[PDB]
Design a protein around this ligand. Structure first.
Ligand SMILES: Nc1ncnc2c1ncn2[C@@H]1O[C@H](COP(=O)(O)OP(=O)(O)OP(=O)(O)O)[C@@H](O)[C@H]1O
Ligand SMILES: Nc1ncnc2c1ncn2[C@@H]1O[C@H](COP(=O)(O)OP(=O)(O)OP(=O)(O)O)[C@@H](O)[C@H]1O
Ligand SMILES: Cc1ncc(COP(=O)(O)O)c(C=O)c1O
Ligand SMILES: Cc1ncc(CO)c(C=O)c1O
Ligand SMILES: Cc1ncc(CO)c(C=O)c1O
Ligand SMILES: [Mg+2]
Ligand SMILES: [Mg+2]
Ligand code: NA
Ligand code: NA
Lengths: 307, 310
């Protein structure tokens, strides 16, 4: 038929983050995705410099209005990510509500960007007054959430130390509304070694209500990447759509695609930088286009273990 | 590569025109295309309704300011299309003029959007005070322009009544600046019927030996009973791409471009008729180019139309 995705995320002229990381991948996979750029910057804030303007509530509403007037406010998925403005996010919520009112089956894939951890623990890189809005108004509306450990901790108030406390916290989120919760990265240890970050997933469905929990030990890459979480949420949406009731497979293809892309990025980043020289943010920009075939049909280089 | 392209055009949420019609295709063909969205509307202005905001001179300058501070102002191509502000257009010209100081080998592909013609009568749909800026500043800086007939007559000053006047206009356009001039559409006579639009190509280049030569082509394309939007931008985009792959063969660049456009519209029209259903003209929404569904056609266009050598 036709799968339309409304994607309200950031836009950078140069590089791949927000809608730049989310759009191409989703188009290559056959999704009619529409990109509302919550901001337009020359590049991500991971660089020394950056310039750009921002889209305010009034404008997002103005834009949604045009879609409504034309009777084009019927979607199958809504995708959202990083937001700094409290009022902006409220407006986003009002939009999703009406989009779900228009189509009762619409899926809201929310990546609750609040902050991350470095070494021991983290710090939020978003106004704190936004946390309440997420717990109360955003997550309840969301059907799929993809937070990292630190964000899953902030949304639940419960700190995570082990695979079991993580499932407990994921279980809490589920009761908040999300039928699919995926922790995209964590400090949890792996039997594979110290060079492995851990992904955990949890999906609630009926077949008769039944759960499906999966685990994944992904090898770390010696560098900091931007736009990877957005690409994760974006590809999760895609493969979950193509393989419903199979979180295992959907996650294996998602993480695998991330693998290939980063594998190619780090390589070009090394050859482009000096051997023995830490690549710069610019050299570490996801080699998105060069990864078209991996995104289309990613070679599964990772098996998720059922919990 | 990577082959870098700066595309400063319009963006819309729903549908494909401007940056939305050019980005996916070029990304699919491996081009690292950075998009500077000049405006952000809900949809194109062909729908009953449309709301949105627009980018202005300063913001475009600021966005450019960031790219420069990070030493990211080195591109292989610059792609521009429908511009609405004499102010914005001047800022674009200043930017393209610096990207060329930064990299002399840079290629500016400019679609001089001015207007078009319907049933014979042509008129503009952009501020008239834009024509001087294009003539004196934009075209001189261009390397590949893709104006339709009307814009070709406006840029040169000579109405095009036959294939002869077209070619004379192209020579004129060449003298103005760009070595590649493609008249994306014209209602010239075709030895195949009335329902055929004509495309004309002309490229100037010096070969290995060093002799400056010119290759000219002509394509007679059958008309689809419908009015689409984004096709001109898609044409300029693919031209940028195919001339890149086949630098010294304008006949192949064009054959592929026009053929890609064919497969897209062919799939778009039949998928629009089913949507509007038997009898009813397809609405502007049902006629939105079926871009993501034509991925395979963009990557490797099956050539359905061979150009005529002039
Ligand atoms: N350094 C890395 N090494 C290996 N994989 C990585 C690395 N960084 C990111 N990834 C991949 O990207 C995915 C998302 O991780 P990241 O830590 O980038 O997102 P998050 O921080 O989990 O998301 P967000 O910051 O939006 O809340 C990881 O699951 C992994 O597949
Ligand atoms: N109705 C149509 N039937 C057949 N082909 C079309 C039709 N409309 C557009 N095309 C194709 O798209 C190309 C661009 O034509 P269009 O008339 O859409 O652009 P232009 O008007 O030439 O460009 P611009 O609007 O920027 O001045 C044509 O050369 C042709 O290949
Ligand atoms: C006023 C106006 N400008 C520009 C366009 C864009 O056309 P193109 O993609 O062929 O340049 C349209 C399409 O309907 C239009 O109505
Ligand atoms: C504008 C903008 N949007 C989103 C992100 C998160 O990747 C960043 C990270 O630096 C950013 O700068
Ligand atoms: C905002 C906006 N920008 C560019 C174009 C050119 O197709 C249109 C056509 O309708 C538009 O609406
Ligand atoms: Mg992280
Ligand atoms: Mg036209
Ligand atoms: Na995440
Ligand atoms: Na044209």
């Amino acid at each position: 038929e036709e799968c339309r995705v409304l994607s309200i995320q950031s836009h950078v002229i140069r590089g791949y983050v927000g809608n730049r990381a989310a759009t191409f991948p989703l188009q290559v996979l056959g999704f009619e995705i529409d990109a509302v750029n919550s901001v337009q910057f020359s590049n991500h804030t991971g660089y020394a410099h950056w310039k750009g303007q921002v889209l305010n509530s009034d404008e997002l509403q103005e834009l949604y209005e045009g879609l409504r007037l034309n009777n084009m406010n019927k979607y199958d998925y809504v995708l959202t990510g990083y937001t700094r403005d409290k009022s902006f996010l409220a407006m986003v919520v009002d939009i999703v509500q009406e989009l779900k009112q228009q189509n009762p089956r619409l899926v809201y894939v929310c990546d609750p960007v609040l902050g991350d951890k470095w070494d021991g623990e983290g710090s939020m890189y978003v106004p704190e007054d936004l946390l309440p809005v997420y717990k109360e108004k955003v997550v309840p509306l969301a059907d799929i959430i993809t937070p990292n450990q630190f964000e899953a901790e902030l949304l639940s108030g419960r700190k995570i130390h082990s695979q079991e406390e993580a499932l407990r916290v994921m279980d809490m989120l589920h009761s908040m509304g999300p039928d699919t919760v995926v922790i995209t990265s964590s400090d949890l240890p792996s039997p594979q070694g110290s060079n492995y970050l851990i992904v955990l997933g949890s999906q609630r469905r009926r077949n008769s209500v039944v759960m499906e929990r999966i685990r994944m030990d992904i090898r770390k890459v010696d560098a900091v990447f931007v736009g990877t979480g957005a690409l994760f949420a974006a590809m999760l949406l895609a493969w979950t759509h193509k393989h419903p009731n199979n979180l295992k497979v959907a996650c294996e293809k998602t993480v695998s695609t991330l693998h290939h892309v980063l594998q190619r990025t780090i390589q070009c980043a090394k050859a482009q930088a000096g051997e023995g020289v830490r690549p710069s943010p610019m050299q570490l920009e996801l080699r998105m286009v060069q990864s078209k075939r991996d995104i289309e049909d990613p070679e599964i280089v990772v098996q998720a273990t059922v919990l």
